[PDB]
XYZ file of C-alpha atoms in Angstrom:
717
model
C 71.954 71.317 129.613
C 72.995 68.494 127.424
C 75.491 66.086 129.097
C 77.061 62.603 128.725
C 76.438 59.966 131.408
C 79.108 57.992 133.187
C 77.369 54.885 131.884
C 77.806 55.964 128.344
C 81.498 56.988 128.768
C 82.467 53.696 130.374
C 80.789 51.952 127.418
C 82.755 53.876 124.908
C 86.022 53.316 126.815
C 85.197 49.597 126.801
C 84.782 49.376 123.058
C 86.892 52.277 121.644
C 90.624 52.280 121.673
C 92.018 55.756 121.095
C 94.267 55.804 118.170
C 97.217 57.408 119.853
C 100.353 58.059 117.762
C 103.696 57.013 119.238
C 103.945 60.522 120.730
C 100.165 60.959 121.196
C 99.386 60.380 124.795
C 102.402 62.168 126.043
C 101.583 65.151 123.874
C 98.045 65.160 125.290
C 99.167 65.033 128.842
C 101.399 68.008 128.740
C 99.273 70.087 126.360
C 95.506 69.629 126.746
C 94.987 67.865 130.115
C 93.746 70.490 132.517
C 94.576 70.422 136.195
C 91.828 69.289 138.516
C 92.276 71.007 141.979
C 89.529 68.928 143.493
C 91.236 65.635 142.634
C 94.779 66.839 142.752
C 95.661 65.535 139.374
C 95.480 66.347 135.687
C 92.642 65.144 133.485
C 92.520 61.742 131.679
C 91.686 61.579 128.011
C 88.057 60.367 128.432
C 87.459 63.379 130.839
C 88.882 66.020 128.500
C 86.785 64.801 125.594
C 83.718 64.894 127.811
C 83.946 68.535 128.686
C 84.930 69.420 125.135
C 81.903 67.669 123.644
C 79.563 68.926 126.334
C 80.910 72.420 125.931
C 80.159 72.493 122.199
C 76.758 70.821 122.136
C 75.356 73.261 124.743
C 76.015 76.080 122.318
C 73.207 75.137 119.978
C 70.864 78.206 120.034
C 67.665 76.186 120.155
C 68.567 75.056 123.638
C 67.957 78.715 124.585
C 64.260 78.546 123.610
C 62.458 76.088 125.932
C 63.981 73.063 124.097
C 61.575 70.199 123.444
C 62.238 66.813 125.104
C 62.888 65.424 121.598
C 65.397 68.215 120.804
C 67.434 67.612 123.954
C 67.596 63.796 123.304
C 68.564 64.218 119.736
C 71.385 66.597 120.761
C 72.340 64.157 123.480
C 72.802 61.407 120.909
C 74.670 63.687 118.501
C 76.976 64.457 121.386
C 77.461 60.786 122.103
C 78.526 60.173 118.458
C 80.783 63.205 118.725
C 82.383 61.845 121.908
C 82.943 58.375 120.244
C 84.521 60.111 117.274
C 86.918 62.324 119.084
C 87.762 59.929 121.875
C 88.924 57.518 119.130
C 90.960 60.364 117.518
C 89.270 59.828 114.162
C 88.659 63.590 114.170
C 89.171 66.452 116.633
C 88.520 70.208 117.154
C 91.330 72.672 117.388
C 93.973 72.454 120.080
C 92.409 75.574 121.660
C 89.037 73.797 121.887
C 90.609 70.714 123.492
C 92.194 73.021 126.078
C 89.239 75.332 126.882
C 86.009 73.878 125.521
C 83.610 73.255 128.435
C 85.688 75.092 130.955
C 84.692 77.898 133.419
C 87.202 80.246 131.720
C 85.529 79.567 128.362
C 82.050 80.302 129.628
C 83.304 83.507 131.119
C 85.491 84.702 128.241
C 84.281 85.924 124.855
C 85.992 84.854 121.639
C 87.588 82.037 123.723
C 86.707 79.296 121.183
C 88.412 80.902 118.077
C 92.237 80.964 117.777
C 92.913 83.076 114.690
C 91.593 86.383 113.350
C 92.233 89.020 110.702
C 92.027 92.843 110.918
C 92.791 95.717 108.589
C 95.236 98.404 109.973
C 93.188 101.456 109.220
C 91.319 103.883 111.570
C 87.991 102.282 112.620
C 85.219 102.722 115.151
C 85.288 100.520 118.223
C 81.474 100.188 117.935
C 79.530 98.615 120.762
C 82.155 96.230 122.029
C 83.379 95.082 125.452
C 86.297 97.328 125.033
C 85.736 100.980 124.266
C 88.034 103.912 125.195
C 86.337 106.394 127.566
C 87.203 109.374 125.410
C 85.658 107.722 122.356
C 82.105 107.672 121.219
C 80.828 104.360 119.864
C 80.620 105.241 116.172
C 83.730 107.426 116.437
C 86.685 106.179 114.353
C 90.066 105.959 116.104
C 93.626 105.157 114.924
C 94.020 102.802 117.863
C 91.063 100.540 117.046
C 92.811 97.905 114.830
C 95.724 97.666 117.239
C 93.418 97.219 120.209
C 91.686 94.394 118.349
C 94.935 92.702 117.584
C 96.309 93.306 121.072
C 93.154 91.832 122.648
C 92.937 88.638 120.524
C 96.654 88.124 120.976
C 96.313 88.353 124.804
C 93.450 85.795 124.565
C 96.009 83.499 123.047
C 95.090 83.670 119.414
C 96.981 84.530 116.363
C 96.128 87.606 114.178
C 96.715 88.308 110.544
C 96.608 92.018 109.684
C 96.821 94.169 106.584
C 99.119 97.158 106.214
C 98.477 97.452 102.487
C 99.284 100.908 101.232
C 95.514 101.514 100.906
C 95.076 101.102 104.637
C 98.254 102.966 105.767
C 97.262 105.981 103.659
C 94.045 106.095 105.701
C 96.040 106.849 108.845
C 96.216 110.664 109.567
C 99.411 112.647 110.157
C 100.964 112.128 113.583
C 99.874 115.429 115.066
C 101.537 115.332 118.526
C 104.739 113.842 119.849
C 103.719 112.594 123.270
C 105.770 112.815 126.428
C 105.364 109.491 128.297
C 106.060 108.415 131.833
C 105.341 104.920 133.116
C 104.816 104.793 136.904
C 105.333 101.708 138.957
C 105.224 102.673 142.701
C 108.187 101.694 144.947
C 105.723 99.402 146.759
C 104.952 97.162 143.803
C 106.629 93.704 143.873
C 107.661 94.595 140.242
C 109.210 97.986 141.051
C 112.887 97.194 140.489
C 112.304 95.152 137.347
C 110.145 98.011 135.966
C 112.727 100.642 136.718
C 115.090 98.522 134.630
C 112.792 98.767 131.617
C 112.119 102.448 131.899
C 109.423 103.028 134.553
C 109.867 105.635 137.277
C 109.169 105.441 140.971
C 106.322 107.559 142.363
C 109.043 109.777 143.732
C 110.859 110.359 140.381
C 107.562 111.140 138.695
C 107.336 114.560 137.145
C 103.759 115.679 136.975
C 101.846 118.877 136.406
C 98.173 119.899 136.366
C 97.907 119.541 132.522
C 99.176 115.925 132.371
C 96.796 113.120 131.297
C 96.850 110.369 133.926
C 95.572 106.766 133.805
C 95.511 104.207 136.439
C 95.578 100.719 134.817
C 93.090 98.196 136.054
C 95.028 95.003 136.588
C 93.135 93.336 133.666
C 93.672 92.497 129.936
C 91.406 95.332 129.124
C 93.504 97.626 131.199
C 96.494 96.789 128.990
C 94.546 97.358 125.720
C 93.046 100.637 126.873
C 96.420 101.954 127.986
C 97.997 101.364 124.491
C 94.823 102.728 122.948
C 95.076 105.954 124.945
C 98.829 106.331 124.182
C 98.139 105.926 120.442
C 95.112 108.101 120.216
C 96.861 111.011 121.883
C 99.126 111.372 118.751
C 96.162 112.497 116.638
C 94.123 115.720 116.889
C 90.939 113.899 115.953
C 90.981 112.001 119.328
C 92.788 114.745 121.278
C 91.085 118.139 121.099
C 92.913 119.501 124.157
C 96.200 119.066 122.186
C 97.451 117.491 125.467
C 100.970 116.043 125.053
C 101.655 114.924 128.582
C 100.698 111.277 129.375
C 101.265 109.469 132.603
C 100.343 105.779 132.700
C 100.270 104.206 136.192
C 100.861 100.441 136.276
C 101.346 100.079 139.999
C 98.384 97.663 140.105
C 99.525 95.304 137.399
C 100.176 91.854 138.982
C 103.749 90.645 139.203
C 105.523 87.919 137.192
C 104.423 84.431 137.862
C 101.131 85.611 139.331
C 98.154 83.363 138.662
C 96.200 84.165 135.465
C 92.686 83.067 134.200
C 92.578 81.136 130.899
C 96.102 79.701 130.723
C 98.222 77.036 132.371
C 101.020 79.639 132.477
C 101.210 82.704 134.713
C 101.561 86.489 134.432
C 104.603 88.271 132.923
C 104.589 91.310 135.085
C 104.224 94.806 133.676
C 107.813 94.911 132.421
C 106.969 93.780 128.863
C 104.078 96.211 128.786
C 106.438 99.099 129.773
C 108.926 98.384 127.027
C 106.004 98.077 124.466
C 104.519 101.389 125.401
C 107.945 103.172 125.280
C 108.899 101.585 121.989
C 105.378 102.093 120.491
C 105.643 105.785 121.513
C 109.010 106.204 119.774
C 107.752 104.755 116.524
C 104.864 107.276 116.706
C 106.981 110.273 117.899
C 109.761 109.560 115.399
C 107.094 110.420 112.862
C 105.602 113.372 114.675
C 104.291 115.934 112.126
C 104.751 113.283 109.434
C 102.965 110.046 108.177
C 103.034 106.454 109.297
C 104.417 103.888 106.865
C 103.520 100.207 106.618
C 106.800 99.544 108.327
C 105.752 101.759 111.219
C 102.280 100.144 111.399
C 103.799 96.643 111.248
C 106.494 97.637 113.818
C 103.782 98.671 116.372
C 101.870 95.326 115.761
C 105.132 93.529 116.245
C 105.974 95.362 119.364
C 102.567 94.452 120.730
C 102.953 90.742 119.846
C 106.362 90.840 121.353
C 104.825 92.129 124.727
C 102.367 89.266 124.724
C 104.955 86.597 124.085
C 106.797 88.278 126.945
C 109.702 86.326 128.289
C 108.336 82.967 127.279
C 101.438 84.664 116.195
C 101.043 87.377 113.623
C 100.959 87.788 109.768
C 101.560 91.181 108.265
C 100.119 91.454 104.704
C 101.326 94.452 102.738
C 101.533 95.776 99.160
C 103.707 93.979 96.583
C 105.340 97.298 95.512
C 106.149 98.395 99.039
C 109.763 97.697 99.100
C 110.290 99.047 102.646
C 107.768 96.680 104.052
C 109.069 93.746 102.067
C 112.597 94.370 103.347
C 111.745 95.274 106.919
C 112.589 91.786 108.389
C 115.994 91.766 106.737
C 117.311 94.465 109.154
C 119.181 92.234 111.470
C 119.111 94.409 114.605
C 115.374 95.145 114.335
C 114.644 91.512 113.411
C 116.260 90.409 116.655
C 114.370 93.109 118.662
C 110.840 92.630 117.463
C 110.168 92.145 113.773
C 110.467 88.413 114.361
C 106.983 88.715 115.851
C 105.187 88.347 112.431
C 105.764 86.575 109.224
C 105.222 88.933 106.267
C 103.508 88.441 102.879
C 102.421 90.479 100.015
C 99.024 90.850 98.268
C 98.850 89.947 94.631
C 96.363 89.118 91.874
C 96.412 86.747 88.945
C 97.531 89.563 86.646
C 100.665 90.015 88.762
C 103.940 88.534 87.403
C 106.631 90.422 89.342
C 107.758 87.326 91.093
C 111.481 87.918 90.267
C 112.224 89.901 93.430
C 109.753 87.852 95.450
C 111.591 84.694 94.501
C 114.930 86.268 95.434
C 113.617 86.965 98.938
C 112.209 83.474 99.386
C 115.452 81.876 98.297
C 117.065 83.687 101.135
C 114.841 83.599 104.124
C 111.581 82.033 102.908
C 109.909 85.477 102.878
C 107.814 87.028 101.755
C 104.766 84.811 101.454
C 101.944 85.511 98.976
C 98.247 86.034 99.245
C 96.063 86.295 96.131
C 93.139 88.422 97.264
C 91.772 88.357 93.758
C 91.256 84.558 93.641
C 90.283 84.493 97.314
C 87.334 86.857 96.798
C 86.183 85.244 93.506
C 86.534 81.531 94.100
C 85.517 78.783 96.428
C 87.044 75.540 95.091
C 88.756 76.302 91.836
C 86.787 73.533 90.163
C 83.552 75.362 90.892
C 84.859 78.153 88.655
C 85.024 81.963 88.896
C 82.136 83.452 90.882
C 82.219 87.236 91.153
C 82.296 88.348 94.778
C 81.363 84.956 96.343
C 83.752 85.957 99.146
C 83.901 89.680 98.406
C 84.543 90.824 101.966
C 87.790 89.047 102.110
C 90.779 91.269 102.918
C 93.375 88.934 104.295
C 94.038 85.623 105.994
C 95.144 84.183 109.387
C 98.870 83.580 110.307
C 98.782 79.997 108.830
C 97.026 81.308 105.793
C 94.394 78.590 105.291
C 91.292 80.684 105.839
C 90.067 83.611 103.645
C 88.977 86.283 106.082
C 87.214 89.624 106.371
C 87.968 92.412 108.788
C 87.420 91.206 112.352
C 86.534 87.661 111.316
C 87.821 84.607 113.086
C 89.039 81.122 111.882
C 86.732 78.356 113.029
C 88.385 74.915 112.386
C 87.735 71.230 112.893
C 90.206 68.591 111.811
C 89.425 65.171 110.392
C 91.907 62.318 109.735
C 90.358 60.286 106.976
C 92.521 57.125 107.268
C 92.072 56.912 111.079
C 88.343 57.654 111.056
C 87.848 54.836 108.555
C 90.025 52.466 110.563
C 87.830 53.286 113.650
C 84.881 51.985 111.711
C 83.357 55.382 110.763
C 81.600 56.346 107.531
C 83.495 59.518 106.396
C 80.414 61.190 105.063
C 78.958 60.967 108.603
C 82.287 62.233 110.166
C 82.370 65.365 108.011
C 78.711 66.123 108.802
C 79.370 65.944 112.594
C 82.426 68.131 111.872
C 80.375 70.705 110.084
C 77.827 70.981 112.871
C 80.508 71.241 115.599
C 81.991 74.219 113.840
C 78.583 75.820 113.036
C 77.750 75.802 116.627
C 80.960 77.655 117.644
C 79.602 80.543 115.488
C 76.889 81.071 118.147
C 79.325 81.547 121.021
C 79.820 85.015 122.753
C 82.005 87.456 120.816
C 83.332 90.730 122.273
C 83.731 92.849 119.187
C 80.823 94.290 117.267
C 82.529 93.900 113.933
C 83.156 90.170 114.580
C 79.454 89.583 115.648
C 78.259 91.281 112.432
C 80.583 89.522 109.951
C 80.005 86.119 111.577
C 76.206 86.623 111.460
C 76.656 87.291 107.759
C 79.127 84.463 107.016
C 78.870 81.672 109.566
C 82.202 80.569 108.116
C 83.491 77.130 109.032
C 86.746 75.465 108.225
C 86.544 71.724 108.184
C 90.138 70.594 107.692
C 91.426 67.378 106.320
C 94.710 66.069 107.949
C 96.707 62.928 107.525
C 96.107 63.449 103.808
C 99.340 61.837 102.563
C 98.726 58.708 104.758
C 95.153 58.511 103.538
C 96.022 58.739 99.842
C 99.129 56.543 99.736
C 97.218 53.819 101.541
C 93.992 54.037 99.708
C 95.563 54.690 96.335
C 98.920 52.976 96.455
C 100.543 56.076 95.110
C 100.676 59.949 95.499
C 97.933 62.098 94.174
C 100.384 63.338 91.572
C 101.094 60.245 89.375
C 103.274 62.248 86.883
C 103.610 65.204 84.575
C 102.643 65.848 80.937
C 103.723 68.575 78.521
C 101.514 71.631 78.013
C 101.655 75.419 77.674
C 100.748 78.450 79.766
C 97.127 79.541 79.127
C 98.259 83.158 78.501
C 101.936 83.283 77.370
C 101.782 79.848 75.690
C 105.038 79.072 77.597
C 105.843 75.359 77.603
C 105.318 73.885 81.052
C 104.987 70.615 82.931
C 101.499 70.106 84.205
C 100.713 67.409 86.820
C 98.611 64.280 86.173
C 96.319 63.550 89.107
C 94.919 60.190 90.271
C 91.359 60.685 89.196
C 90.315 58.387 92.139
C 91.461 61.125 94.535
C 89.135 63.671 92.945
C 86.037 61.640 93.663
C 86.962 60.813 97.252
C 87.706 64.384 98.214
C 84.745 65.762 96.200
C 82.215 63.536 98.008
C 83.558 64.754 101.385
C 83.276 68.343 100.316
C 79.717 67.836 99.167
C 79.012 66.039 102.490
C 80.068 69.149 104.488
C 77.971 71.422 102.280
C 74.815 69.245 102.615
C 75.436 68.968 106.355
C 75.685 72.778 106.604
C 72.665 73.385 104.301
C 70.399 71.156 106.462
C 71.645 72.511 109.793
C 71.350 75.991 108.609
C 67.649 75.395 107.785
C 67.042 73.797 111.211
C 68.713 76.654 113.061
C 67.352 79.280 110.764
C 70.702 81.028 110.240
C 72.755 81.860 107.114
C 74.609 78.992 105.348
C 78.416 79.065 105.707
C 79.936 81.324 103.112
C 82.850 78.764 102.933
C 83.307 75.353 104.467
C 86.671 73.649 103.941
C 90.406 74.099 104.253
C 93.642 72.335 104.950
C 95.734 73.072 108.061
C 99.062 71.488 108.929
C 98.153 71.402 112.688
C 101.267 69.891 114.114
C 100.374 69.354 117.776
C 96.953 67.797 117.239
C 98.124 65.682 114.352
C 100.734 64.210 116.805
C 97.945 63.123 119.099
C 96.886 60.597 116.353
C 100.283 60.107 114.751
C 98.930 61.432 111.427
C 100.814 63.239 108.669
C 100.235 66.985 109.196
C 97.705 68.531 106.780
C 98.899 67.818 103.324
C 102.612 67.670 104.331
C 104.700 64.591 103.693
C 106.616 62.764 106.443
C 110.142 63.735 107.358
C 111.188 60.166 106.994
C 109.914 56.534 106.742
C 111.671 55.326 109.960
C 112.780 57.819 112.397
C 113.792 58.455 116.020
C 111.773 61.411 117.113
C 113.022 63.315 120.133
C 110.654 65.036 122.624
C 112.115 67.482 125.021
C 111.040 67.590 128.661
C 111.974 69.697 131.718
C 114.173 67.582 134.029
C 111.382 67.907 136.585
C 108.534 66.764 134.467
C 106.338 64.133 136.167
C 106.209 61.998 133.022
C 109.914 61.276 132.876
C 110.003 58.519 135.513
C 107.147 56.790 133.735
C 108.881 57.064 130.352
C 112.148 55.855 131.719
C 110.312 52.908 133.448
C 108.855 51.934 130.028
C 112.211 51.447 128.181
C 112.433 54.736 126.261
C 115.969 55.985 125.735
C 116.872 59.391 127.210
C 119.714 61.833 127.247
C 120.433 65.294 128.479
C 119.401 67.837 125.823
C 122.449 69.742 124.529
C 120.476 72.720 123.210
C 118.693 73.665 126.451
C 119.678 73.708 130.121
C 118.030 71.266 132.531
C 116.134 69.443 129.796
C 115.967 65.781 128.858
C 115.429 64.316 125.460
C 113.288 61.141 125.144
C 113.677 59.015 121.949
C 110.469 57.746 120.317
C 110.891 55.238 117.385
C 108.295 55.911 114.779
C 107.193 54.211 111.578
C 105.299 56.236 109.013
C 102.354 54.810 107.186
C 103.345 53.251 103.930
C 106.941 53.305 105.059
C 107.692 50.356 102.831
C 105.697 51.466 99.803
C 107.928 52.324 96.903
C 105.636 55.317 96.390
C 106.442 56.575 99.821
C 107.945 60.036 99.589
C 109.868 61.767 102.334
C 109.649 65.662 102.564
C 113.271 65.915 101.629
C 112.863 63.929 98.345
C 109.599 65.494 97.073
C 110.214 67.854 94.190
C 109.100 71.525 94.561
C 107.055 70.995 91.340
C 105.182 68.108 92.930
C 104.458 70.033 96.197
C 102.907 72.900 94.165
C 100.715 70.446 92.275
C 99.556 68.737 95.434
C 98.569 71.986 97.105
C 96.850 72.938 93.817
C 94.970 69.690 93.777
C 93.446 70.271 97.240
C 92.641 73.926 96.327
C 90.947 72.810 93.103
C 88.834 69.884 94.409
C 88.626 70.207 98.277
C 89.086 73.591 100.001
C 86.850 76.471 99.205
C 88.903 78.523 101.584
C 92.654 78.197 101.224
C 95.343 75.513 101.576
C 97.988 75.987 104.277
C 101.316 74.197 103.565
C 105.008 75.009 103.534
C 106.592 74.085 100.287
C 110.255 73.246 101.055
C 112.854 73.098 98.302
C 116.626 72.304 98.000
C 118.962 75.100 96.889
C 119.280 73.261 93.619
C 115.607 73.932 93.097
C 115.643 77.597 93.857
C 115.799 78.197 90.110
C 112.193 76.982 89.937
C 110.560 79.155 92.608
C 109.757 82.100 90.350
C 108.606 79.724 87.613
C 106.270 77.723 89.755
C 104.746 80.846 91.412
C 103.951 82.118 87.929
C 102.631 78.733 86.737
C 100.028 78.610 89.496
C 99.012 82.291 89.529
C 95.465 81.223 88.558
C 95.044 78.563 91.281
C 96.962 79.377 94.506
C 95.184 81.670 97.031
C 98.231 81.844 99.261
C 101.808 80.492 99.151
C 104.489 79.845 101.702
C 107.914 78.484 100.725
C 110.985 77.697 102.700
C 114.463 76.618 101.772
C 114.698 72.932 102.847
C 117.170 73.637 105.566
C 118.537 71.097 108.029
C 122.337 71.118 107.520
C 123.035 68.568 110.105
C 122.012 68.604 113.816
C 124.099 66.688 116.289
C 121.043 65.812 118.287
C 118.347 65.899 115.727
C 114.635 66.203 116.798
C 114.016 63.855 113.844
C 116.727 61.307 113.097
C 116.126 58.929 110.138
C 116.851 55.147 110.618
C 116.431 51.919 108.603
C 113.617 49.454 109.228
C 115.926 47.094 111.020
C 116.958 49.692 113.627
C 113.339 50.804 114.069
C 112.191 47.324 114.921
C 115.069 46.771 117.302
C 114.384 50.110 119.130
C 110.626 49.733 119.402
C 111.272 46.317 120.975
C 113.045 48.146 123.710
C 109.788 49.805 124.617
C 107.635 47.168 126.297
C 105.892 49.392 128.812
C 102.654 51.203 128.447
C 103.468 54.754 129.581
C 99.809 55.776 130.127
C 99.320 52.812 132.540
C 102.677 53.073 134.259
C 102.112 56.856 134.830
C 98.797 56.238 136.490
C 100.233 53.486 138.592
C 103.174 55.620 139.813
C 100.965 58.650 140.347
C 98.913 56.440 142.704
C 101.744 54.984 144.626
C 103.674 58.240 144.759
C 101.957 61.304 146.384
C 102.424 64.695 144.661
C 104.061 63.176 141.566
C 102.409 65.964 139.514
């Protein structure tokens, strides 16, 4: 087993200073630092990175076949470089990886290293997977399969994109039987009352007869999935020969709310959310008994499921562009508040499509729907590499953030690099992206629970090396924004006069070399391992949380402002508050949430004093489209995630721009530049003078003060 020595760590810590953003360390402490029962304290940065790096390196498949002494030392040195890179924050894996990589939970939980997936909502076989209904054969198709997949990955903390295109919904058979459902929660359970409140009946009130179908739920994630799978499959004759229409699900064993759970810092929700979900999911199905399920019904069930996972504390529905019922489903206020908020909805289009008029109207109202061009996604890598028939022919959708082109049951597999920071930390970018590629490649050899995922991954070995802090990197290195201006031109088909962007040709070369570096890295590593080369390699994700660790601009997004006071909200009991107060940070009771404290962090954006500096509120919608297009053309062979924000005075341009880029954009997400005016803004803009004054008030090092207090005060955490 490859590992890093204490001697090496201390050396890195001695020469490498983590490039924390003004909110970085704090964000790390309350987000990725796991609790150490042995030591009675949460992890320190160096420790987290150690287990993350070790957890990834030990995935290399060669280490499974009597690894040679040379092999193990080479991997050890690669791990040491990896540790130095991540520790310095010049690059990092996904937030999920930072939280679970190298942990006991990870090693005992399949799919634990991937945070997003895609699945088509059409009857499918469960195949030889960890979860398989008892009443189902392996190769036997079931209506519940896609829902079970989504339910499972969602409970494992991931996000799931799914397709309810008309083509899939039509594959779902007529709802043959309206099922009578009773949810039992024994009077003895510590969740009895609470459950009765949501519709469950005591063991006494239970009305049973010999013909009823009965299932005792094991107090496990699988128990939850199988119970919803049973409920669904009983509505269809194909998976219910006995025509039994009496189901009794017993959730007396489900652990109560607050109960300790494996794989999360949080606790259990109790069976209550599961009860409601099963009851509501049954209604949607019963309400169509003898009829047919629509995309709205299919999406509602997925939404109800997502809602049950969120519980009392992550989806993307992709449908047909002509399905008006689906497109309008989230506008129903009552149902939006009850569960349709669970997913963000988009429609599938192709380059031939031009019906953007109604789509634009929707977008100008609520920012929905989003768009996914399956045509371009299946026939293109980077747009510059031109049309390539079926290069990604198995693509059927994308993940919730929409940066990865995905096939049915396929997961996202990301790694984020911050070009500006890596360079400032003395790294050669070409080498950074190569380490990135290999990290991702290894994740593809981790344990996966679903057969369909194993197969597709074996064939694709897809990786998604993301580039973040893009605006900081370009403004600094170029002195201006990738889009230097616009020149006149005409639409390639309609000859319509339009404004095309002029890109800084310097940017093309720098991103192109990095792309080729990831491809070379993947080609060589694929040879060494003897597996398939990654079908795709790059993308852009606006990973907010991780970008905060390093204080980098998120994905390709622009900064909210040059100089700002950023407010971070903490529970009044949070261990970090005394340390922050001791360091000079200004605090105030939060007016939007009870028992919460706001802490003010003065922040200066890179290039704040550059006349080419652009704040998100001032960047034209036309320029945002051009910027996304640039990255999709010369960098990402997957997609480009970014929220294009516009002022109402720009709404007249939404339909026009969507049409203009119909031959380049794989997916689009627009949102009316809201804001209005918040009395206690999470991001308040200030002038340079105010920023300097405020930052001078902070003369204490929170990381050091926290450790000191933690030491002098017992049970601070």
